[PDB]
């Protein structure tokens, strides 16, 4: 079976409880995770140890908090007490865990399922070939010996409009924002990097990225996490918003792909 789970945010107990609910069995089943494995919840260290141990039985995409953790580890960014990352950062296997983490994808595609996963979704300004190329470019910088330079370079809110002519720092920043920070778009598809509210509460003329017809969404189902204020609701057919806010006192959500059956684990918080 194929299971997809939204943002875990260090909620190790809820993750394991949900996987036990569906009798997740590596070798028979595959788990997709939308990223943001770490921060806020108490168990980022246990989450990373477990997910890394799954090997080929898990298909991860990196989220914005995963990248922030990598920036803290590399001395690029300051640790915020609220993130509850110190046990992971101080662990004896931190290097092993974080060098594995930075090598994980930004984008997962299963052609037989016609299923695409990214942390924030797929901007309607991208077709599939472009999304693939952009994921490969950023994955290349993150897996390289010089990844602290990219992590420093990623921070920024501009440019917010895709063009194949984008180059250099702006290109990398857009790619990072599209995969890991996207929520709202302007009518022309340009990213808004400020509004984090639910679709009903956003200022006009902002619309969710998935409300704008895009070439990937016309051919593929898209699963994503990230947007907790969406509460997993309000999406069109073929769009699966899996982040139901577990670390916020919401729930952890698991979707089984074969029958589109949902399983939910209440937050312990
Ligand atoms: C609230 O909503 C904001 C966005 O939370 P979410 O988990 O949706 O996404 P992220 O923090 O990754 O932008 C945070 O400032 C919380 O304090
Ligand atoms: Mn998140
Ligand atoms: Mn996120």
Question: What is the signed CA dihedral for 97, 76, 5, 174, rounded to 10 degrees?
Answer: -130
DSSP three-state, residue 76: coil
Distance (Å, rounded) from C-alpha 213 to C-alpha 210?
Answer: 7
How many angstroms does the Cα of residue 220 sit away from the middle of ligand 3?
A: 22
How many angstroms does the Cα of residue 226 sit away from the middle of ligand 1?
A: 8
Which atom of ligand 1 lies closest to the CA of 248? 7
Quote the number of domains for the chain: 1
How many angstroms does the Cα of residue 228 sit away from the middle of ligand 1?
A: 7
How many angstroms does the Cα of residue 141 sit away from the middle of ligand 3?
A: 20
Burial of 248 (0-12, 13-18, 19+ CB in 10 A): middle
Q: Provide the domain limits for residue 117.
A: 2-266
User: Ramachandran region of residue 152, left (φ > 0), alpha (ψ -120 to 50) or beta?
Assistant: alpha
Mutate to test the pocket of ligand 1, among 10, 82, 191, 228 (most ligand atoms within 8 A of CB): 228
Distance (Å, rounded) from C-alpha 108 to C-alpha 106?
Answer: 7
Query: What is the residue with the minimal CA distance to atom 17 of ligand 1?
Result: 248
How many angstroms does the Cα of residue 197 sit away from the middle of ligand 1?
A: 9
In this structure, what CATH number is given to the domain that contains residue 70? 3.60.21.10
Lining residues, ligand 1, CB within 6 Å: 64-65, 196, 227-229
> CA end-to-end span of the chain, whole Å?
29
Give the DSSP per-residue string, 152-195. HHH------S--TT--HHHHHHHHHHHHHT--EE-TTSPEESS-
Distance (Å, rounded) from C-alpha 217 to C-alpha 211?
Answer: 10
| Cβ contacts of 156 within 8 Å, gap of 6 or more | 169, 173, 177
Q: What is the resolution of this structure in A?
A: 1.7
Which atom of ligand 1 lies closest to the CA of 228? 8
**Selection from 103, 177, 91 nearest residue 134 by Cα:** 177
Query: What is the residue with the minimal CA distance to atom 7 of ligand 1?
Result: 228
| Cβ contacts of 168 within 8 Å, gap of 6 or more | none
How many angstroms does the Cα of residue 175 sit away from the middle of ligand 3?
A: 15
Burial of 95 (0-12, 13-18, 19+ CB in 10 A): exposed
Query: What is the residue with the minimal CA distance to atom 10 of ligand 1?
Result: 226
């Amino acid at each position: 079976a194929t299971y997809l789970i939204g943002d875990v945010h260090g909620c190790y107990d809820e993750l394991i409880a949900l996987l036990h609910k569906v009798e997740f069995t590596p070798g028979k089943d595959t788990l997709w995770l939308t990223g943001d494995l770490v921060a806020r919840g108490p168990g980022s260290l246990d989450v990373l140890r477990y997910v890394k141990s799954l090997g080929d039985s898990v298909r991860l995409v990196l989220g914005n908090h995963d990248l922030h953790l990598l920036a803290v580890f590399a001395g690029i960014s300051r640790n915020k007490p609220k993130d509850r990352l110190t046990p992971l950062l101080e662990a004896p296997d931190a290097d092993e865990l974080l060098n594995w983490l930075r090598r994980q994808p930004l984008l997962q595609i299963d052609e037989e399922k016609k299923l695409v996963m990214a942390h924030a979704g797929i901007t309607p300004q991208w077709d599939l070939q472009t999304a693939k190329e952009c994921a490969r470019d950023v994955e290349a910088v993150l897996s390289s010996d010089s990844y602290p330079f990219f992590l420093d370079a990623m921070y920024g809110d501009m440019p917010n409009n895709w063009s194949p002519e984008l180059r250099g720092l702006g290109r990398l920043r857009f790619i990072t924002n599209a995969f890991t920070r996207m929520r709202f778009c302007f009518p022309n598809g340009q990213l808004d990097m400020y509004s984090k509210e639910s679709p009903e509460e956003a200022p006009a003329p902002l619309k969710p990225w998935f409300a704008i017809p895009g070439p990937v969404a016309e051919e593929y189902s898209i699963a994503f996490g990230h947007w907790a204020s969406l509460e997993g609701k309000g999406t069109p057919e073929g769009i699966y918003a899996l982040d139901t806010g577990c670390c916020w006192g919401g729930t952890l959500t698991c979707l089984r792909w074969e029958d589109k059956q949902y399983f939910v684990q209440p937050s312990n918080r």
